[PDB]
Design a protein that fits this description.
- This is part of a larger assembly, with chains A, B, C, D and E.
- Chain A has a two-stranded antiparallel sheet.
- Chain A contains three helices and two strands; from the N terminus they run E-E-H-H-H.
- Chain B is built from five helices and 15 strands.
- Chain D is mainly alpha-helical.
- The chains are: A mainly alpha, B alpha+beta, C alpha/beta, D mainly alpha, E mainly alpha.
- The interface between B and D is medium-sized, with 13 and 18 residues.
- Chain C binds one RNA strand through loops.
- It is classed as splicing.
- Keywords: spliceosome, splicing.
- The entry is titled "Cryo-EM Structure of Pre-B+5'ssLNG Complex (core part)".
RNA sequence: AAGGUAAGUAUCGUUCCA
């Protein structure tokens, strides 16, 4: 089954004319915002540490604050006692 | 007098198997060797109880997604499932945790169920307002005893006699009592002088705190 | 605290000051286990994303990097230093010390206030900026 | 800070050391979301979350909520009794109340 | 290496001077925190079992 | 004892130090 495209005047398959009208009128300036923010996030640099860095910092913090971590309590800044 | 008029009524023998040092600070290999040491294993800790304690699930702390602020109703058998070898509770204390599993080896003529509603948090004491769905004239406890002891008792069924219900905060409370008049079945509610023959459903609806049974 | 990027040796912090030209480098010198340093290392967490455009935050443990203690007076438990284009931006507070914020604060808006004021005064080309709030007291009453 | 740090430390500690450790920020965001949901009194039920992670997060939320309630009431007592408190302290305490 | 020896001598002298009640004060604080660790436990072992269950 | 440093650009002197 063939229909006629309202915008281009060319024979088109009847099965596609729905998404043909959805996509043949794709707004041209939409392409930049699709291709602009993604580039911004691609070039964007992270703010927080990588997860392994959080893990290591957590280990180092646990090394000192024995009032919370560990089983052998010691001073706030002392490694072990 | 190891056995007096009140001891042979509420006291029952109880078995406890306790393991210690399951602490996560120990690595896997060290804990494997520790349990291999044969020093830290289940132990013979049989003693006596004047009353069985009941530990409830914590309050939901969140609204249910469909019906907000849903009332937490838990069957009694879930609570009583603590007293068997299947389940074991971690009564952690001080540095090392203590994993204890409970067991019953002598059912007293009357079984007392105290309920741990009031508990202290890290900062302030609160209450656990978890309602319990519990029968009053038919319950079976035979699964909680070893068979080498189950043969002794031909009566493991208990009927409720008295019930304790508490009101409000710990610092502002008003106890109420559900008493069963034996011979009849009239359950009466007494707070200070109150007298009211309630139905056997208001006993289930309210949150119990101390329950009295009878093995018959 | 632990979420923000950390610097381990003396070269890294100097590079972090040098590896930027269009923002402000806000360095929290101190010990992340300190009760004081942990009070404001969560304020610096809550605003790290917000000030991404004109501020980058690095954390430094003075014990791990014992190279700037003598020169920048790292003896208060917690210190905050602002750098712009490899230039320490002095900031005039209500306190006598005008080179650092040696106390941990509580409000997530005031720190963005101070950082944006520093950026605004650094684009002009100043060396000492003036904070909006006065810290000669605590406004407690 | 100490309670949240301990919770994250335990969760990341028993979390496998693979490449999956990239999910630390995910765990922190889950903790923050659960705390917000309790603060907002809104149902919080992550579908795909494991039951041990969910149990630990519930315990974290309960502990921080107990401390939150106690601290809010203590600060209110300080303010009503006439003690010397800050403006931001008053704002945060009013929000909590 | 005389400067290091002098510094060590003075540090050892000061450390000797704190032995007037060091062994008693440290033992007292050790026993004192253990009474505090009963009512107010540590957070990590408050999450000990759940950490194990993870 | 404080909460009272304007930030800069210049030649000149000195001194330790590499």
């Amino acid at each position: 089954e063939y229909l006629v495209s309202p915008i281009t005047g060319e024979k088109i398959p009847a099965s596609k004319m729905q998404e043909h009208m959805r996509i043949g009128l794709l707004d041209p300036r939409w392409l930049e915002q699709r291709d602009r923010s993604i580039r911004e996030k691609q070039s964007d640099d992270e703010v927080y540490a990588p997860g392994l860095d959080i893990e290591s910092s957590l280990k180092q913090l646990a090394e000192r604050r024995t009032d919370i971590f560990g089983v052998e309590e010691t001073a706030i800044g002392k490694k072990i006692g | 007098k190891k056995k007096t008029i009140v001891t042979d009524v509420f006291q029952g023998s109880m078995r406890i198997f306790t393991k210690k040092l399951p602490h996560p600070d120990l690595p896997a290999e060290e804990k494997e060797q520790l349990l291999h040491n044969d020093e830290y294993q289940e132990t013979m800790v049989e003693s006596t109880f004047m009353y069985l304690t009941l530990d409830l699930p914590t309050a939901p702390l969140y609204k249910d997604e469909k019906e907000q602020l849903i009332i937490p109703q838990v069957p009694l058998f879930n609570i009583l499932a603590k007293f068997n070898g299947i389940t074991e509770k971690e009564y952690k204390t001080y540095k090392e945790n203590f994993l204890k599993r409970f067991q019953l080896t002598k059912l007293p003529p009357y079984l007392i169920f105290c309920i741990k509603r009031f508990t202290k948090n890290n900062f302030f004491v609160e209450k656990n307002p978890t309602i319990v769905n519990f029968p009053i004239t038919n319950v079976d406890l035979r699964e909680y005893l070893s068979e080498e002891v189950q043969a002794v008792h031909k009566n493991t069924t208990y009927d409720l006699i008295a019930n304790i219900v508490h009101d409000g905060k710990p610092s502002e409370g008003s106890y109420r009592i559900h008493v069963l008049h034996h011979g009849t079945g009239k359950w009466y509610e007494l707070q200070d002088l109150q007298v009211t023959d309630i139905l056997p459903q208001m006993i289930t609806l309210s949150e119990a705190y101390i329950q009295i049974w009878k093995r018959r | 605290s632990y979420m923000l990027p950390h610097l381990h040796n003396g070269w890294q912090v100097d590079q972090a000051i040098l590896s930027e030209e269009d923002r402000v480098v806000v360095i929290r010198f101190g010990h992340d286990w300190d009760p004081t340093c942990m009070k404001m290392d969560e304020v610096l967490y809550s605003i790290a994303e917000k000030v991404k455009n004109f501020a980058v935050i690095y954390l430094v443990d003075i014990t791990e990097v014992p190279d700037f203690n003598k020169m920048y007076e790292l003896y208060d438990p917690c210190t905050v230093m602002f750098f712009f284009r490899n230039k320490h931006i002095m900031i005039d507070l209500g306190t006598g010390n005008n080179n650092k914020i040696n106390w941990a604060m509580e409000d997530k808006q005031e720190m963005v206030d101070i950082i944006e004021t520093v950026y605004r005064g650094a684009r002009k080309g100043r060396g000492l900026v003036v904070s909006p709030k006065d810290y000669s007291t605590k406004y407690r009453y | 800070l100490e309670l949240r740090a301990a919770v994250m430390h335990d969760i990341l500690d028993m979390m496998p050391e693979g490449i999956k450790q990239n999910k630390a920020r995910t765990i922190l965001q889950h903790l923050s979301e659960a705390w917000r949901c309790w603060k907002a009194n809104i149902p919080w039920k992550v579908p795909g979350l494991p039951t041990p992670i969910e149990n630990m997060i519930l315990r974290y939320v309960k502990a921080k909520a107990d401390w939150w309630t106690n601290t809010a009431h203590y600060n209110r007592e300080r303010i009503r009794r006439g003690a010397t408190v800050d403006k931001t302290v008053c704002k945060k305490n009013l929000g909590r109340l | 290496k005389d400067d290091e020896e002098a510094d060590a001598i003075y540090a050892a002298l000061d450390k000797r001077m704190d032995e007037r009640r060091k062994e008693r004060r440290e033992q007292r604080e050790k026993e004192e925190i253990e009474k505090y660790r009963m009512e107010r436990p540590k957070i990590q072992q408050q999450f000990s079992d759940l950490k194990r269950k993870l």
